[PDB]
Design a protein around this nucleic acid. Sequence first.
DNA 1: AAAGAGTATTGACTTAAAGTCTAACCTATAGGATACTTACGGACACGGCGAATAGCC
RNA 2: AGCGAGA
DNA 3: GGCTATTCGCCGTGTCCCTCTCGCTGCCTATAGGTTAGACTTTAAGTCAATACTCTTT
Length: 1254
Amino acid sequence: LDVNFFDELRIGLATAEDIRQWSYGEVKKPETINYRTLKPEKDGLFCEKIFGPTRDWECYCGKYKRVRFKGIICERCGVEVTRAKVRRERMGHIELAAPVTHIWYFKGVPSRLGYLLDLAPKDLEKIIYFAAYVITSVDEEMRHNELSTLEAEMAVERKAVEDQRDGELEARAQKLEADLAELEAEGAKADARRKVRDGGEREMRQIRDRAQRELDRLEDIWSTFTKLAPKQLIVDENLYRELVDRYGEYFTGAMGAESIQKLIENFDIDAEAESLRDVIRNGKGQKKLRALKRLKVVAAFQQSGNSPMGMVLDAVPVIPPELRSDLNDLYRRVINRNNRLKRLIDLGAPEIIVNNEKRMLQESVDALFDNGRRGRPVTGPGNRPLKSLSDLLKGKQGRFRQNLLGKRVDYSGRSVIVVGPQLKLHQCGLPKLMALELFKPFVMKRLVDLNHAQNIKSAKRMVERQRPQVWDVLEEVIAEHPVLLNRAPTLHRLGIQAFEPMLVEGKAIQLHPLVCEAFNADFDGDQMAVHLPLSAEAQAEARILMLSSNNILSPASGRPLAMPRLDMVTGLYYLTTEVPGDTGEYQPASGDHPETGVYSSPAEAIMAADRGVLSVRAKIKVRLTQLRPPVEIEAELFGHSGWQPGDAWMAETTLGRVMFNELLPLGYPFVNKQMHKKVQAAIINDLAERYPMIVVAQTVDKLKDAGFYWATRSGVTVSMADVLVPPRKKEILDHYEERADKVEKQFQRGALNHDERNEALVEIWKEATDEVGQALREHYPDDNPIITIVDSGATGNFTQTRTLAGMKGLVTNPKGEFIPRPVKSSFREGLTVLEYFINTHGARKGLADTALRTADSGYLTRRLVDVSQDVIVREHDCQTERGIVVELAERAPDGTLIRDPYIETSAYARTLGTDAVDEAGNVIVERGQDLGDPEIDALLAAGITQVKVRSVLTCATSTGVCATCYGRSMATGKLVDIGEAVGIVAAQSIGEPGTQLTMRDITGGLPRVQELFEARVPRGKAPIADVTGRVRLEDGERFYKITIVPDDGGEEVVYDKISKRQRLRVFKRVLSDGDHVEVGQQLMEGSADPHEVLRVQGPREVQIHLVREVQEVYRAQGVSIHDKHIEVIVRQMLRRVTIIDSGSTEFLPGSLIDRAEFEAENRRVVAEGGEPAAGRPVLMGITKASLATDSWLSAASFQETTRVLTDAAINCRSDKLNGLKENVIIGKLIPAGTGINRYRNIAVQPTEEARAAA
DNA sequence: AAAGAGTATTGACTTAAAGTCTAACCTATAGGATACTTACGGACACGGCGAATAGCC
RNA sequence: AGCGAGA
DNA sequence: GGCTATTCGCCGTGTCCCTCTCGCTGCCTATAGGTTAGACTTTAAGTCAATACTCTTT
Ligand SMILES: [Mg+2]
Ligand SMILES: [Zn+2]
Ligand SMILES: [Zn+2]
């Protein structure tokens, strides 16, 4: 059977010997099962004598029927009596009467047979489908001697044909003499005599033409010989049969697959490989390019021990009888045609019939291995293609991406989800029936242990009728058993989290609200699947790694994802905001009474608020004795070691803020700020950074509770009366309609064309839009429900508010342009019919655009994951000096350090490569620090901008990356572990903001991202500066010519065809003709292809370019992704070098070889004679990088299955099963996280003191 | 010390099963001779190939 | 195999 | 003067197109051999039942 001894997996061409070695028999009849008794036939497609017994442990006839007869073969029927399941294991084989060629190596462009034999594809096809003869052997020296003899014999034949030729000419002459005698002897017409005479000499012209035909037929054949050599096709078999009958010897010409077999027999690989290598080394140009193409496959066969006989097949293997009859029918066709061929050869048949039958057999094998590849697919009942033996493997519905990496699983459930706010963050409701069913084994065990049932089957009966006693035991068993909750699609790592389940009454998984965002799961009919870990390892993994309370911060940007939002944030905003002039406010008036605003303790404040005296949102002064004061008050009152739990201090704030601040931990200082969602996020981020995660969970949960309660009390409701239109709307409408009418009049006088007036109206109405928006904003009070919800950060944006009251605005044309009408009505006021009809365009287009974009995003994520499927941490530190530089703050022209806007995703969570230096002073922060917020603050304060940080790009470790160079784990909040699969995390983080990554020709959306990671030359390829020099732009419409005089160098280069419509990117000032340029300044407007920038500026500059561009496109929509994930991908992109000089070491020119292996070869060859094989770095798309891996089982799982398997087979490639996809497919443990060889084999034992306790 | 039950004998009766033989009834194969002798989306990418010009035979 | 539908 | 090679264009074929879930319909005749199936005649295995003696329990 099989064990863990799978260290290496090998694929290769299977020779006929191997095929008949695998087979346990030889099916030779097209009979599946008897129509009447319904049993397999002898020697059929389901023969029990071959593939085993249908029902286990008896032969066909039944002489032996029990287990003790194990491994015995019954003499009567020959069935080996054993287990029945072996029918899924044993193979047959069909011994083809004539050879056939495997399709994959024939039709898959480039035709590997064609390249191996150097036969043109059309030619080869005509050979192997019996349409044109091919020679396979020829003669040499005796060829010379009989060529002289044959020169004499063709002199004889030419003389004979010329003799008949002149005899025909003389017969013409005599018939012409008779004709002229008739013409000029009898009385005939003046022209009729010349009619017959012209006709006669016309007959002679055709006779001389026939002569020329005979000449041709002889000398052309002689010329065919005089330069004859094999592998030479001959169409028009008439010439072939002529040659054979005249030249039966001196060549052997064949037709079909066996012809190719013979061609491969008389084919020495070493001589052809040497000749091709010589041609490449000395010959240049297109000829070299083809010769290189063939050398690929020719070397593939040379280096490996597999001979090219495997391409032509003598026997076809028979898949075991589980396929069970679409595919089976194809097999029947093959067997029918093979048997008929055998009979035809036996009886003795004309060449035509047997040749046609051979062609039919070839076509049948073709259809079997791949139906529809060549010619129309073989169709079945209902006129549909038969699912060929290869269609099982390819596509979405192929075996690789429906059944191997993705499987359906037992012990799982699914239900709709309903918000439950009463649950703790680490809990999830689970309906009683679903839990009972899922846990039916465990509850059975417990109720048999409890003696509620006598035995297992009685217990199973007990549960199947849900007897009343089986609920208490159920509560006992479910306790302390984690469960995973997935919500498809799992866009990112936080799509699946482990909760502790709890029973709930009715049929609905009660989810915790705070994790809603993590799932993006919103309660209107989403269905969340539930999975149940079983093994001790799985339960530990779920309880520890996956627990919902253990994953608060996003793995992408680390911002808290359990943060309160929507309702809770609104409640907190209402609680912590301050309303001057409210009841119970503070007033310091004296001379008549005290301030009457202060309170002894917060408890006093709540007791007053219970009375209708103190509002929760009034300014007051409370003597706090249990909340830590802010930094300044602590530093003033206590200064050094203020022990707050007993100390008291006077706080001038609102009671609501006090009630809030009690929810934070004891150590957190008093905040005293209005709780915008932003401020909440900052608070939670700081809390997670400082305090342990469990505290973060508890605080977040308390926050949710308070938020919901106070949102209920917040008094936020929507009514028409609460939606206040702006009173100045009509005046603005008139004011801007006046300009619109003016533009209409100017157009009606021909002042401007349609496009110009469309743009003018667009501008006028957009201005009107902004004006009414401003009027509405300033018209609203602050306490309004709508402004309250929007401005608190709870949800929605002011554009929606403005559309709700005021004016919706310009509506998109279904092409994408702007309707110049535009809509002038608020939804509150109610849109008119035509305004609504115009509006529908935009919404329908948006909905449509969502679908295609999510499809493309999913595909992109698949690509990125595959490329990064093997980027996992391996070492703590490589100590590599190399690093990248990040700018941080930029010097102000007046002199000042303004923090760079995009610092939170660039330098945060990075390890310093070199010690910081200040004014050539001491080190503020030395090498090897996480560079968390205080560090960057210190650097900014001291006055340093550029800092050298370590990154994955400049990581010295060959395998994966090291912990330090990668930097901080964004999710865990500390340094990375030695098993984290940072590659998968990176890719998923890039892909997650898909769809929400929208757009508004050079691309700028998800297509632009794809292009950046695909290395595709952009459409708007703006030229870039190459060498510093004064520019001499010339004027060419669509073909700007651009000269640049090199500062030092060679020759200025002019760019023949560059688009004029672009706008020159500004330089040190707008870039203009006559200006000295840089080595990288973008000349024109638009992007630049990354290959060019690489070739100009080395690997570092192209790296920085790619990261900057992708980050830009993402930032353009406001999604924050840390730079490091991108760095990981671009690192994966730059790992291969192109070979210019082969040196003398097995490196074909143009080969894409890994840099680590490149260096290894170099250190191998420096000794024993040095031949440095020069190479240059190169940038290759994500797809190519993935498909260039050293693992065929992963590349095959990825895409374009047929080609990758054919290539790997020809190379006899062996997969070492080191990646993640592979380990998934074969079902052994991934080498990542808890699977690597340092954790996978930990030894655990008690202590000697513990043994003493025993 | 007595009685009842179990562990044996033996014969007597009984029924499944099973090994021949039949028979008859399906079942698989071959053959049929006046003369006729031709069907019925769209984008990316690479590799197999138009149009040109110059040099060499 | 084909239809329709939810997220 | 013509053909081929080194240089461009041009066109054709192949590959890909997110995930998860729910319900419903689609001529004839002649030979020879197998074939089990079906009944007859054996068994072989099973069931009943008389009898009696010995051992254990009350
Ligand atoms: Mg929803
Ligand atoms: Zn048998
Ligand atoms: Zn490193």
